[PDB]
Amino acid sequence: GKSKKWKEILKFPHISQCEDLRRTIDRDYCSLCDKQPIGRLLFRQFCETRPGLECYIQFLDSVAEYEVTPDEKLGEKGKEIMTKYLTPKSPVFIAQVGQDLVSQTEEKLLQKPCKELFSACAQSVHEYLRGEPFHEYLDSMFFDRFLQWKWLERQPVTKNTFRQYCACQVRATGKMYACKRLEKKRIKKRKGESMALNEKQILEKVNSQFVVNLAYAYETKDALCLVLTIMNGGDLKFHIYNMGNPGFEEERALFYAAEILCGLEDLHRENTVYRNLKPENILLDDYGHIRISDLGLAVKIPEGDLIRGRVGTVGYMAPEVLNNQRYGLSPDYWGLGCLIYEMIEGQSPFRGRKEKVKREEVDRRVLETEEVYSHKFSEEAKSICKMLLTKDAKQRLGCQEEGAAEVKRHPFFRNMNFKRLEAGMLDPPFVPDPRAVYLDHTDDDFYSKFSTGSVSIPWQNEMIETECFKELNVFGPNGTLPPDLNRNHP
């Protein structure tokens, strides 16, 4: 699906074009060698050229597989990593760990296999690469190649960059996205500038496997567009009621709740509250994984502060929202409660699927009545649901200081290995079939703040998935400088 002319659209600029980038990009190890997908691959590639640095990239790779290794094979996988990297006579012996630190890792291995056994070692390796290896890479041809990729990333994004099928496709890469087309005229009479910008900022700032990500924010003569993750597996409401009993088995509900909890955690790391947690806002992708969508009612809370707002949907409003009180992140754990209850039982905890009730009785129920459970719930499921549905937001699960960690420890997730879930190692319970189908200048300033262009991490991830990186990222034969990286002849 790539425009036949793409090799030229994404043609590397000559390295002499990138001096202003070299001078301004902040040289931070974590950002350039890990957080940014293309910088991580280029630093890894640099370490492969030097021999003494090769073994450190292999070790970190094997430690990554150890953390997600099944609990039974932890003791087994531990020995491998040990006898390969942490034995002085090994060929790939990671040396900068220190003799005093390898001797401690021999004890934790003769004791109990914990998924964090090599966490002490992995840090010691990173603190070595933070030093000399990083600064050589910064003067290497691989950082010059990173600057070229950054130059492409920052190129202007226009309606031409895409191909509307709403669901836009990037022409140069073939990547498929869903685009939210916001008509300009309807945003100004309604005073929606602050809300459209507050939503664009939340979308781009959270990078989460379980929340729709922003990849582009451009302007057209006829709208202001948001380009987001595409989701074709349908929404959770459709699967609870049309594809379910009305409802799911507990184990199936557990998987979705675990992914929804991780999504809420990624939002709360940016101290952003969601407030819109309802089944039809949980979407499935093509693989059966979910993401939280529709952040229009989201808002960033300043650390240490509260907010007001009676917003959301009837039935899915926490009692502190219905009473219009100063609240924090607590409405989202009330919403997780409603979601787990509704997945298991097949109806909201305060409104029967077959009840004809008014908005008012629903609200009275949310504030006074204690939801009742059935045999579809295990004791652990009853526990987590009625703790997330604690009306007093001060005694509600996760609304304390520990946060979402207080919820992952709950016995309801006792058989759930989050480390493997966050890594995509667990198979979803349902896989959607592929073929299925489940003019003042003040405006110009708001427009310029919105149309910021391509988002950094999703754009680099797009280049890697579509194999544009693999094919374009080529150097000279035998460690030589390609023409685009040689200043002697532009």
Cα end-to-end span (Å), the chain: 32
To the nearest 10°, report the CA torsion of 272, 273, 274, 276.
-160
C-alpha to C-alpha distance for 464 and 484, rounded to whole angstroms: 20
Cα–Cα nearest to 236, from 274, 314, 290? 290
Q: Which residue, 318, 375, 373, 323, is CA-closest to 347?
A: 373
Alpha carbon dihedral 180, 185, 191, 193, in 10-degree steps, equals 50
Contacts of 157 (CB under 8 A, 6+ apart): 216, 217, 218, 453, 454
Rounded Cα distance between 221 and 183, Å, is 10
Phi-psi region of 191 (alpha: psi -120 to 50; beta: other; left: phi over 0): left
Enter the DSSP assignment of 480: B
3-state secondary structure of 325: coil
Across-strand partners of 182?
Answer: 224
DSSP string computed for 382-437: HHHHHHHT-SSTTSSTTSSSSTTHHHHTSGGGTT--HHHHHTT-SPPS----TT--
Q: Do 236-422 and 6-152+467-485 have the same topology in CATH?
A: no
Angle between helices 37-49 and 141-153 (to 10 degrees): 160
Radius of gyration for the chain, computed over Cα atoms and rounded to the nearest angstrom = 25
Tokens of 204: 């781009």
Backbone angles phi, psi at 428, to 5 degrees: -60, 160
Experimental method: X-ray
Main-chain phi, psi angles of 435, to 5 degrees: -70, 0
Domain 6-152+467-485 listed as CATH 1.10.167.10: yes
- The CA distance from 122 to 217, in Å, is 37
Place of tokens 């630093």: 43
Q: How many whole angstroms separate alpha carbon 272 and alpha carbon 300?
A: 4
- Of 164, 232, 192, 151, the C-alpha closest to 437 is 232
- Rounded to the nearest angstrom, the gap between the alpha carbon of residue 135 and the centroid of all alpha carbons in its chain is 29
Of 128, 12, 13, nearest in space to 59 by CA: 128
User: 236 with 343: CB under 8 angstroms?
Assistant: yes
Q: Give me the long-range contacts of 441-450 (CB less than 8 A, separation at least 24).
A: 443/184, 443/188, 446/193, 446/197, 447/219, 447/224, 449/197, 450/196, 450/197, 450/200, 450/217, 450/219, 450/224
Query: What is the maximum alpha-carbon separation in the chain?
Result: 78
Nearest of 333, 316, 319, 335 to residue 367 by alpha carbon: 319
Q: Are 1 and 169 in contact (CB under 8 A)?
A: yes
Query: 157-187 b/e with 16+ CB inside 10 Å = b?
Result: beeebbbeeeebbbbbbbbbbbbbebebeeb
Q: Which class would CATH give 236-422?
A: mainly alpha
**How far is it, in rounded angstroms, from Cα 126 to Cα 438?**
45
Give the separation between CA 86 and CA 89, rounded to whole angstroms: 9
From the centroid of its chain, how far is CA 451? 22
Q: How far is CA 308 from CA 33, 127, 169, 299, in A?
A: 40, 43, 39, 11
Resolution, given in Å to one decimal, reads 2.7
SS3 for 284?
strand
Which residues contact residue 116 at a Cβ distance below 8 angstroms, ignoring those fewer than 6 apart?
A: 67
- Copy the structure tokens of residue 5: 């002319």
Paired strand residues for 284: 290
- CB of 162 within 8 A of CB of 453? no
Q: Where are the domains of the chain?
A: 6-152+467-485, 156-231+439-454, 236-422
Token output for 180:
């939210």
CATH number for the region 156-231+439-454 comes to 3.30.200.20
Cα angle value 195/199/200 (rounded, 5°): 120
Q: How many residues can be counted in the chain?
A: 490
Q: What is the DSSP string of 51-106?
A: STTHHHHHHHHHHHHHHTS-GGGHHHHHHHHHHHHSSTTSTT---TT-HHHHHHHH
